[PDB]
């Protein structure tokens, strides 16, 4: 006979925030323990793809607040915000677009 | 309630649990520190 | 499971054999014999019962040299090279006590790992 369980906290609805697991206790009882909600993790900007960043953990609220700064970023520029391919694109684009402005401005000054 | 137990009965309450009764009164469960015997203070109160 | 079974194969069921054998079960019948309930003829019947009622390889009676019985010092010893459950010799004991009609007078209990013992109801 499969034992039947009851809700143990005052909320009794099967929502995404009220998910429980069945737990066998040292007293050989089957109880319900609430599943902690999860975060999706640190992502890149939605306009840039919305992809999970490398070297960053997925922590929720209290966990992200008490964790060290390295669980949520890298040592590279824009660490924990942009990815390695997005940072390299900006470094190249910052230098190359600036160079074109210098060449065009010098050409104007020479004429 | 913890301060009033100090002034009235010269005891320390390490825990107070309170409920409001179904007749409207509030009842307090006052646990004393191990330094104080609750039976000795009950005798001094007069409820023995 | 791997090979489909046959109904004719029930005439011989392969039993597991211990790699390092000599497992011994002891049934202590001292208390019934001390009081006189288990007399010498009953002691012989008890030893004889286990000889021709213990099913080895699905067969009852042909114990071969794999199962040895030796009733010494009022206890029964069962030394085997096969994987025998200890519960089998408590189940075989009750069949003897039921046939002799003392299942309501003598109870079989467990004392140690590998030993059973015959007592009286409290």
């Amino acid at each position: 006979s499969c034992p039947r369980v009851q809700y143990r906290r005052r909320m009794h609805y099967a929502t995404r925030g009220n998910r429980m697991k069945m737990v066998r206790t040292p007293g050989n009882k089957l109880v319900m323990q609430k599943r902690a909600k999860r975060s999706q993790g640190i992502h890149t900007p939605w306009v840039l793809g919305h992809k999970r960043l490398g070297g960053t953990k997925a922590l929720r609220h209290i966990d992200a607040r008490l964790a060290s700064r390295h669980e949520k970023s890298v040592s590279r520029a824009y660490g924990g915000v942009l990815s390695h391919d997005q940072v390299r694109d900006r470094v190249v684009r910052a230098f190359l677009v600036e160079e074109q402005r210098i060449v065009k401005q010098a050409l104007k000054e020479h004429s | 309630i913890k301060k009033a137990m100090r002034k009235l009965y010269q005891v320390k309450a390490v825990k107070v649990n309170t409920l409001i009764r179904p007749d409207g009164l509030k009842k307090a469960y006052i646990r004393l520190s191990a330094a104080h015997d609750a039976l000795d203070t009950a005798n001094k109160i007069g409820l023995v | 499971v791997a090979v489909r079974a046959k109904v004719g194969s029930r005439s011989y069921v392969r039993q597991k054999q211990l790699a390092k054998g000599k497992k011994v079960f002891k049934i202590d019948c001292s208390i019934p014999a001390a009081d006189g309930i288990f007399s010498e003829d009953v002691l012989g019947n008890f030893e004889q019962f286990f000889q021709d009622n213990t099913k080895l390889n699905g067969r009852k009676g042909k114990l071969s040299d794999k199962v040895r019985l030796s009733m010494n010092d009022n206890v029964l010893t069962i030394s085997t090279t096969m994987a025998y459950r200890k519960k089998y010799f408590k189940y075989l004991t009750k069949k003897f006590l039921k046939k002799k009609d003392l299942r309501d007078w003598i109870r079989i209990l467990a004392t140690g790992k590998g030993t059973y013992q015959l007592k009286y109801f409290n």
Binding site: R10 | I20, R21, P22, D23, G24 | -
Partner: protein
């Protein structure tokens, strides 16, 4: 069920205290006219609905 305002719980508590019979010694007063509580309430007869 479990939820009620404290104000609602305190109205229900007073109604519980009023749900008592008349004391026996009230009937022995000089000009007494009360024999039973005419304002007795049962949860299955009449609803307070607080």
């Amino acid at each position: 069920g479990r939820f009620k305002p404290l104000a609602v719980k305190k109205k229900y508590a007073k109604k519980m205290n009023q749900n008592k019979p008349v004391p026996y010694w009230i009937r022995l007063r000089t000009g007494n006219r009360i024999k039973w509580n005419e304002k007795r309430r049962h949860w299955r007869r009449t609803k307070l609905n607080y």
